[PDB]
Amino acid sequence: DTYAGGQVATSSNVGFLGSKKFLDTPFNTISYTDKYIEDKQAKDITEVIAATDPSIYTNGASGGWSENYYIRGYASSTNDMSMNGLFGITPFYRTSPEMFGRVEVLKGPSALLNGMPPAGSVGGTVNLVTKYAADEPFARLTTTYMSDAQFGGHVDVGRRFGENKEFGVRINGMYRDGDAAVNDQSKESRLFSLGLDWQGENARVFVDAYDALDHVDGVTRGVNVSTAVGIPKPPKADTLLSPDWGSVETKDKGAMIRGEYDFSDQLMAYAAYGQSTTEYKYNGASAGTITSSTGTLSSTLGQLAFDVDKKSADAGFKGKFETGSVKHQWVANATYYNHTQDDYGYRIIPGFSDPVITNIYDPNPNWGPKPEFTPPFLFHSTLSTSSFGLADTLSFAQDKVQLTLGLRHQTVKATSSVNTLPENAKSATTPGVALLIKATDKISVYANYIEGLTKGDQAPATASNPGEIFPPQKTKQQELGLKVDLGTFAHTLSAFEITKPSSYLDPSKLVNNLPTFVSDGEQRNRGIEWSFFGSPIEHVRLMGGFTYLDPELTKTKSGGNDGHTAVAVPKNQAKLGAEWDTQVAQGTLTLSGNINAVSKQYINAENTLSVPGRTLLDVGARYSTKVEDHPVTFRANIYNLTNKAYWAQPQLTNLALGAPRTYMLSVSYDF
Amino acid sequence: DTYAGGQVATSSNVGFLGSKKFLDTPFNTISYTDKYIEDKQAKDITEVIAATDPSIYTNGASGGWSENYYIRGYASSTNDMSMNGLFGITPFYRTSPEMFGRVEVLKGPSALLNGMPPAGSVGGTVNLVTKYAADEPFARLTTTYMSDAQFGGHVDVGRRFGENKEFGVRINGMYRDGDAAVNDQSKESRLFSLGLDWQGENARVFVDAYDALDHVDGVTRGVNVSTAVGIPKPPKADTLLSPDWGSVETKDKGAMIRGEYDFSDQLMAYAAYGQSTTEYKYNGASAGTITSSTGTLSSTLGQLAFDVDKKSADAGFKGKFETGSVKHQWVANATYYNHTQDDYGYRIIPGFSDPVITNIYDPNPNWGPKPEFTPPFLFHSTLSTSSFGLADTLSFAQDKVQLTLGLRHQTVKATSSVNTLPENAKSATTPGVALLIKATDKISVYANYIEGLTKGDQAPATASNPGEIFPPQKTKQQELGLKVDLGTFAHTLSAFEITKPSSYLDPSKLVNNLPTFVSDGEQRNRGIEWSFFGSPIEHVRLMGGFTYLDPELTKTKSGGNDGHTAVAVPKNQAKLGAEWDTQVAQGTLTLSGNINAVSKQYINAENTLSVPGRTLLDVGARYSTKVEDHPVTFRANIYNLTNKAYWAQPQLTNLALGAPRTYMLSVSYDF
Amino acid sequence: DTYAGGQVATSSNVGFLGSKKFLDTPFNTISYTDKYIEDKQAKDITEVIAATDPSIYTNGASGGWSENYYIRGYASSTNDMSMNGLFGITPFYRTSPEMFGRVEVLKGPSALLNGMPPAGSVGGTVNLVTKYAADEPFARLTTTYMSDAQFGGHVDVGRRFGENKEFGVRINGMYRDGDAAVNDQSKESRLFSLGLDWQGENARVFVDAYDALDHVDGVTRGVNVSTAVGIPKPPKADTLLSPDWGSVETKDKGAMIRGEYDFSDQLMAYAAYGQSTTEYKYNGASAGTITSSTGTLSSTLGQLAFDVDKKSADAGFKGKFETGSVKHQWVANATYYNHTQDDYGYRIIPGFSDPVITNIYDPNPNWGPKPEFTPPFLFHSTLSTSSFGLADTLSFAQDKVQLTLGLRHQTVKATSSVNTLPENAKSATTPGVALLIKATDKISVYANYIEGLTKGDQAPATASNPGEIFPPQKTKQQELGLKVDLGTFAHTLSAFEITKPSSYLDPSKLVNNLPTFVSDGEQRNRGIEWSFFGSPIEHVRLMGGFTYLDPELTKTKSGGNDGHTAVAVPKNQAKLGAEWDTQVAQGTLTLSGNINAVSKQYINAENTLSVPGRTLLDVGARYSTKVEDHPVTFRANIYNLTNKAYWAQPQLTNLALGAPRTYMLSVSYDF
């Protein structure tokens, strides 16, 4: 199932259409292997999916309170990742990748395929495929270092049981802690995971469970800027511009079960259920504001905690039949997601309401005393979603022409203990259509129309349409593409247009002489993408590509920012990762390099503040051998080799510094 | 005509004496190949000629408004380079070397050979030999990167035409743009060149034309220091100490034609004609001054633009005959150069006359707003030069003794539309003599006497001799040397004394109670040079040397600085470039290193300010292979790999920082 | 005598017990070869012994006025090294290792074996074994570079003479000079050494002499901190926090002779005599004090010079006898050491009495003018020590059980020309016992009890017991260990407890209503050490280990700091140095890496100030080949490759910055 090079897989999960090969998939998809994850020494999902993919963008900060990435120029929430196709299971804000065999990306919205995930983001879907036991007993220990002083280890063990190895047990354990590459920042991660499976004659069961901890001392919050003051030059890249005493901690625990039942070679049922809990806590700056061009920083302090309990389910049937010369491959499913949440916080900490005044260039800032962590209860909230979907792929000529049609009906309801307005469920129906034509055994041409959904907002009691809750809001994509598999090297070329609506109270629009809450806002992202992966020549691997994006705010409240460029994202990206192997003694030496080049980004929707493009370099070396026939692999990587200091836009604040030059070492041994 | 290693050629153009071999040339000469240029990833001529040559010195700044180098301890102006032996064609201030097959240096003055080039510099002559089409059709594409974010490409394509391939067309095109290695500095270069030739039975014609752009944003101008304040420690090497908004742009366009006609095997005529235009624009600091030992910098702003139209010609006869046992090879020529120029500028920019105050160590200097570029017309100027030269080389004893004798008459006139003083042409006659003895077929001993000319200065209205224009001023060299070609490795050892006059207003010589303008000043440069090139053992290349230079101010105004050491140049240099090849899979891996070690330099003629010596290291790797039988070469270079911060003296200001650690990558493919 | 890998030897000198093998030595011992020394490009003894040994700690500053290291958590003075077993010969404060064949370490105190060395330090003994002529004539030249601009060379030549090569001459000469890796620091070293030997039938003579110079401009003195102000973040690693004009120079000259006479195979005599002189001069800061969290530094200036003339001797007998099945090997000796010293200095320099005020973060501090060096004579002083010792090693059960017993009687007297208090000799008697069991041919278990001695302090005139001189003070060790020699790889596991007394004025213990001077203080170091060396698989070398140390202040003045952790030393260390060889062309390429990880250290005995742990990385490459059958080796090393900035505790002041990233190159050629 692995492509030449061993770092990319040949198939991925296409939502409820299930597993499909590269040349059969009328969507821009990529699937990274666990070998790739270990080769990058990836510490989070971003470090897997953003490194070579020009359609993914991260601000690249070290030690933030979550991962942050865009796909096709739109936010793709960490909340919205799937685990083996099921949403609401994965860690809330950051995921260390040790428990995954594959990390899959499907670019653009996918409501027909996947329904509406909990945060309603539309950029793309990240699907994490868990590890299960291979046939041969397996035990691998890996030790890790990351500068300045973060040490860790990871154990991965598998074995199968029973007369026909019908049972599997796969366990991963990981711990790392210590000072990171940013001053006064330390990063602690912990994971324990279990992947269990039973393979029956007609039936199969897969069970996954994990317990995770993510903790950052000296967490990065980022800083705000104004047009009056402007953006000063970035301090050196290892500067921490949030309180040294600030910290974030997230505990995630999840479990899921999937069953499959083969009625025949033409019909199968499946059911999946899962639950997870998240406990988040944050004590630190709510925002730092740069109040002078000389680097004065005024930081207000805040505290936040929330606890959320999630449950999710997805069940259905898949079948196939041939009528005349036409093959039908169909799927029908029903999905459910529910969460209950409690929020706690201080906007103003009692006794700590004065801002802390520092300077961003000070080598020795005084962040003052740490406020005790005691945020009071604010409100209880719930979210409930359900869907049911149907799709059919009609094919002829041995699958060389494939037309997919489907619909999904989606419902959503939200509640909050402090909302006084009506709370009602709302629904929408979302279609999709895709066409794929195989020009040759190597070339597929495809097109799709598909939507993304986002929970509707609620009009205030003051509106002409008072208290109206909008139905799920449709993001719309059209895409045309071309895929070429030359054998050991593969290309994808695609062009897309995606429109995403937004809602606001508009006093320019009266009904009954009252302001109307409208869904009249729009962002439109047009893009063209050329990407590639594999081995173009023997002993060489290349992954990367080029994108041009036009992310336009086409319609904004009062028209003030109409035609402006969306914030945060660059219009242009070029990424290339290369590896070259040489046989030396009794093993393989690999040298690697990465270049990541982006153009400028706007910091505000007025487009009066921006930060420039930047190009980052990475280099690495790997040595793979056997010691007494035991596989051993040594890895060394330097990220941000030039130690470029740059501003980029995180969530919730205007700017954060990009990660500094970072050294990583690992050694693995197979018992 | 390539020496072992492929990086140095075995002959060069010895002004109007034409092409001569290494062991037949009674001057210290070196010629670099286009292979060497590509191997260094040279971006300008300095990066070719300074890297390994201990008789050439550069201050080594990144993104200056021109190149800056000394030869034998005297300035050698960028204005004074020749193209295929003709002056006034090459780019005015910086030349990217993609259109040249050779870059040739002749060390020391050469007025007999070359006449007086436009800026009257005397250190040495740099001759750029253009590319013409080889017999086999040729196409090479190269992609380039230079840190942080400069990307570019270069196409080189040649083909010959006609039944006997008597016509050739060679085209180069190059573009690169983006952030350089210095903070807030970006470099843009563009070149399009055409090399055309026709080879007849008794005649030959060569045509060359190019269009070039050089543009730097965040141009480095340098800073001034005083004895009262002193020289502070250098900021980190990637600091820009000129306005971040400052920029320079030079557009150069040139064309030349050379024709030769063979009357017989004993007589030939030749003629060369060319023209060029330069359009220069600068908006930035005119100088920074360090006004405190805390690092306070006061930067006055200025603007300059000039447009210059140049024409140039060189025509003559060459012949040979024998008288008894003596062979004669003689040449007679006439040369002409004319330019017209318009200057525009502000010494004091309206609204920007106050200097911008920063600190050299600040990470966030405030350079203020960028002034609009509207410099008014100042004056029209012209420069005209002409010469008539004669030389004969007499050969005795089967060409083992070669005596060259010659003289040249040189005229020069300058005008300015705002000069009120008389304008008159002035002339001088400059002789030369050189003797070469071939001790063996491998060993040559040589001596020369030769001069360099510089336009005479004009006495100011305040002098006893007001408005007097001095004739062209004679720099005088005597040299003794030894050359040894061992086969695949060669040595040169030479010793020289060069005296250069200077003119000034002298209050110690009163005539009618007024100071007299005199041509009494002198600098005397004495030196010893040992250098070498080639392959001293299999799979190794080695090029470099050692120099000692004693650049003394022997006569100065009022005797105040008599016996002091000249500014800017080091007394000691040691340079070594090494390469080592080894077979790796199906290709050749080359590892390279360079060291460049110099001693201290004085910053003022009083010798009360100095900067220390520094040692710079470079490393590189190259991999040459084939992909489907197409030659491919990968190149990686790190210059200033330790990222040493150092001051050195540029033109017009006292100090500028040396270039920081800089990464360069390239990939070439032959079609 | 060399272990697998060539970097460690299989035996070492165990004080007067003489040469013993690894598995026969009931002490934790290691001996490094001259090959290891050249492989590290070690510039001093610290760079040999601390790199991989987790029981040795250095603060790691560049260009201090001496080396500074701890063994088993106690100071081990540079003054206390032996040369071929003799104390008082080696350079006083820093030793460049070019003249040594072996650098041996014995961990923990060793008074029975070694007596009391001149500074009375107890952490361990470093024994430097000089080079003598091998049988085959030898001549090696090595050139060196160290960043930024330090160049040097080293010649090593040997030849033997006489019909049976019974005479040997071995000469080393080394010079290096230039700018080092710290800002405004330059390092000059010089050495000339001679090793002569005569091998007779029943007698042998060895003579050694050397003349050395160590000079640092921009010497690092370190800085003081208070609890009121605290420890600010370290400036960048290449910062010099002492005067740029400050300098230190030490000249050391030494010579020794050793003679042996074999009366029979059961009895031998030996005698060793030596002398040395040291001339020390220091002009610079006496201390800098950090007086604000903004980085304000107040430096007082001082001058010190001292001259010391040393003489030393060690003579005895060794023999063997048997009592039944028990073999006896015994030794008896007498030792002597005397020095005379003159001290000169200013505590307050006339004209320079005001402190110099700088800031630690200033890139351009103003250190003011350099005071002339004229320190006046202060006082004459002397130190005299003598001992007599006896030991027997009883070997039972075919040498599988080896019991060593002995005692030594030690005397010491000090004088000073400005002391008015009484001056009297004092004595002590010190036992030692060690047991070694060879469990197999590969495995040894051992235990020891042994002491270290330090000259007693003298009670001040203010005490109840004024002028009382305490006898030599007993440091006491118990140790248990395990050694395993697997063949080409070896392990040591040891545990120790060492108590060291200290003396102070106790205000709680009144005699005649006055405080009493007592020898009641104690530090107790408990530790566990796991270390290893050799070649665990072909083409790989690995050296390093892990230690846990508990250095507790068990008894302190007034009980104030009882139970606190001792200053300066970390509780945890992990070190690993690895090398990997592969054939490239006609030679061997070695890649090397080192990691050095330590935990936090306390800065004061109150344990209210500390500095964090740090982890340092080093890398290197070596290429060994032949050119025309002459051995040539190229070496490249980068130390502190991440350029980590850290504080650690030097001698006499609270803090000093660790050495920055440092580049080293060398090339050797064998004639």
- Secondary structure of A389-429 as H, E, C letters: EEEEEEEECCCCEEEEEEEEEEEEEEEECCCCCCCCCEEEE
Query: CB atoms < 10 A from the CB of C555, how many?
Result: 19
Q: What residue of C is the nearest CA neighbor of A239?
A: C233
In degrees, rounded to 5, the angle at the alpha carbon of residue A107 between the alpha carbons of residues A103 and A113 is 90
Cβ contact B614–C147 (<8 Å): no
Distance CA B520, CA C157 (A): 57
Is A582's Cβ below 8 Å from some Cβ in C? Answer: no
For residue A525, CA distances in Å to A55, A73, A532, A600, A604 come to 12, 7, 22, 16, 17
Distance CA C35, CA C22 (A): 19
Beta-strand relationship, A167-179 and A186-199: antiparallel
| Amino acid identity, position A255 | A
Is A145's Cβ below 8 Å from some Cβ in C? Answer: yes
Of B295, B582, B612, the CB nearest to C584: B582
Of C179, C364, C663, the CB nearest to B232: C364
Distance CA A590, CA B398 (A): 60
Query: CB atoms < 10 A from the CB of B137, how many?
Result: 11
Cβ contact C183–B233 (<8 Å): yes
Distance CA B173, CA B193 (A): 7
Is B294's Cβ below 8 Å from some Cβ in C? Answer: yes
Distance CA A99, CA B496 (A): 73
Of A295, A583, A642, the CB nearest to B147: A642
Query: Which residues in chain A are closer than 8 Å to C537, comparing Cβ atoms?
Result: 627
Cβ contact B613–C149 (<8 Å): yes
Distance CA B131, CA C20 (A): 73
Interface test with C, best of B590, B642, B646 (most C CBs within 10 A): B642
Alpha-helix residue ranges (DSSP H) falling in A250-302 = none
3-state SS, residue C15 = helix
Q: With CA atoms as reference, report the closest residue to C130 among C76, C81, C93, C94.
A: C81
Return the bridge partners of B553, or none. B523, B564
Of B295, B539, B613, the CB nearest to C364: B295
Q: With CA atoms as reference, report the closest residue to A62 among A205, A227, A238.
A: A238
Tokens of B461: 């209205």
3-state SS, residue B335 = strand
Query: Which residues in chain A are closer than 8 Å to B584, comparing Cβ atoms?
Result: 582
Return the bridge partners of C428, or none. C410
Residue A173, CB-side half-sphere exposure with 13 Å CA sphere: 5
| Amino acid identity, position C636 | A
Is A150's Cβ below 8 Å from some Cβ in C? Answer: no
Q: How far is A215 from chain C (nearest CA, A)?
A: 20
CA dihedral (A272, A273, A279, A285) positive or negative: positive
How far is residue C34 CA from its own chain's centroid?
16
Interface test with B, best of C148, C150, C362, C586 (most B CBs within 10 A): C148
Of C149, C151, C366, the CB nearest to B614: C149
Query: Which residues in chain C are closer than 8 Å to B294, comparing Cβ atoms?
Result: 362, 364
Distance CA C284, CA C266 (A): 57
Write out C495-529 in H/E/C secondary structure: EEEEEEEEEEEEEEEEECCEEEEEEEEEEEEEEEE
Tokens of B353: 């006359």
Q: With CA atoms as reference, report the closest residue to C359 among C288, C460, C262, C269.
A: C288
Cβ contact C364–B293 (<8 Å): yes
Residue A200, CB-side half-sphere exposure with 13 Å CA sphere: 10
Tokens of C63: 């260009």
Q: With CA atoms as reference, report the closest residue to C503 among C556, C551, C450, C552.
A: C556
For residue A101, CA distances in Å to A36, A42, C578 come to 10, 13, 32
Interface test with A, best of B145, B146, B147, B148 (most A CBs within 10 A): B148
Tokens of A335: 């999905």
Query: Which residues in chain C are closer than 8 Å to A364, comparing Cβ atoms?
Result: 232-233, 293-295, 361
Q: How far is B586 from chain C (nearest CA, A)?
A: 15
Phi and psi angles of residue B468, each rounded to the nearest 5 degrees, phi first: -65, 135
- Beta strands (DSSP E) in C234-266 are 247-264
Distance CA A271, CA A121 (A): 25
Question: What is the experimental method?
Answer: X-ray
Q: What residue of B is the nearest CA neighbor of C148?
A: B615
Is B148's Cβ below 8 Å from some Cβ in A? Answer: yes
Collect all residues with Cβ–Cβ distance below 8 Å to A5 and sequence separation of at least 6: A488, A533, A534, A535, A541, A579
Q: Are B352 and B292 a contacting pair, CB within 8 Å?
A: no
Q: B touches which chains (3+ CB pairs under 8 A)?
A: A, C
Beta-strand relationship, B82-83 and B124-130: parallel
Distance CA A176, CA B132 (A): 62
Q: Are A525 and A541 a contacting pair, CB within 8 Å?
A: no
Q: A touches which chains (3+ CB pairs under 8 A)?
A: B, C
Tokens of B28: 């210290």
Q: How far is C570 from chain A (nearest CA, A)?
A: 15
In degrees, rounded to 5, the angle at the alpha carbon of residue C490 between the alpha carbons of residues C486 and C493 is 115
Return the bridge partners of B452, or none. B475
Q: What residue of C is the nearest CA neighbor of A626?
A: C537
Cβ contact C293–A366 (<8 Å): yes
Is A663's Cβ below 8 Å from some Cβ in C? Answer: yes
Q: Are C286 and C278 a contacting pair, CB within 8 Å?
A: no
DSSP letter (8 states) at residue C34: H
Which residue has tokens 């594999």? A534
For residue A265, CA distances in Å to A89, C395, C595 come to 30, 81, 58
Cβ contact A295–B364 (<8 Å): yes
Distance CA B580, CA B582 (A): 7
Q: Are C407 and C112 a contacting pair, CB within 8 Å?
A: yes
Cβ contact B663–A642 (<8 Å): yes
Query: Which residues in chain B are closer than 8 Å to A614, comparing Cβ atoms?
Result: 148-149, 179
Distance CA A445, CA A337 (A): 35
- What stretch of H or E contains C469? none
If you write DSSP's letter for every residue of A167-193 in order, what string do you get?
Answer: EEEEEEEEEEEEE-SSTT-EEEEEEEE
3-state SS, residue B275 = strand
DSSP letter (8 states) at residue A558: G
Distance CA B34, CA B53 (A): 17
User: What separation, in Å, do the N-terminal and C-terminal C-alpha atoms of chain B show?
Assistant: 25
3-state SS, residue B562 = coil
User: What separation, in Å, do the N-terminal and C-terminal C-alpha atoms of chain A show?
Assistant: 25
Residues 597-636 (B) with a CB less than 8 A from some CB of A? 627
Query: CB atoms < 10 A from the CB of A652, how many?
Result: 13
Question: Exposure of C436 by Cβ count < 10 A (0-12 exposed, 13-18 middle, 19+ buried)?
Answer: buried
CA dihedral B640, B641, B645, B646 (to 10 degrees): -30
Is C591's Cβ below 8 Å from some Cβ in B? Answer: no
A to B CB pairs, distance under 8 Å: 38
Q: What residue of A is the nearest CA neighbor of B149?
A: A615
Question: Exposure of C288 by Cβ count < 10 A (0-12 exposed, 13-18 middle, 19+ buried)?
Answer: buried
If you write DSSP's letter for every residue of B14-43 in order, what string do you get?
Answer: -GGG-EEEGGG-SS-EEEEEHHHHHHHT-S
Distance CA A61, CA A69 (A): 11
Q: With CA atoms as reference, report the closest residue to B62 among B40, B47, B77.
A: B47
Collect all residues with Cβ–Cβ distance below 8 Å to C87 and sequence separation of at least 6: C80, C81, C114, C115, C117, C118, C312, C335, C337
Query: Which residues in chain B are closer than 8 Å to C358, comparing Cβ atoms?
Result: none
Q: C touches which chains (3+ CB pairs under 8 A)?
A: A, B
Of B148, B151, B585, the CB nearest to A582: B585
Which residue has tokens 């007498």? C334
Distance CA A461, CA C656 (A): 67
Of B294, B595, B615, the CB nearest to C364: B294
Cβ contact C363–B235 (<8 Å): yes
Is B361's Cβ below 8 Å from some Cβ in A? Answer: no
Q: Are C104 and C84 a contacting pair, CB within 8 Å?
A: no
Question: Exposure of A270 by Cβ count < 10 A (0-12 exposed, 13-18 middle, 19+ buried)?
Answer: buried
How far is residue A216 CA from its own chain's centroid?
20
Q: Are C639 and C659 a contacting pair, CB within 8 Å?
A: yes
User: What separation, in Å, do the N-terminal and C-terminal C-alpha atoms of chain C show?
Assistant: 25
Cβ contact C235–A149 (<8 Å): no
Cβ contact A617–B147 (<8 Å): yes
Q: With CA atoms as reference, report the closest residue to A129 among A11, A38, A246.
A: A11
Query: Which residues in chain B are closer than 8 Å to C147, comparing Cβ atoms?
Result: 642
Query: CB atoms < 10 A from the CB of A164, how many?
Result: 9
Q: Are C416 and C400 a contacting pair, CB within 8 Å?
A: no
DSSP letter (8 states) at residue A49: H
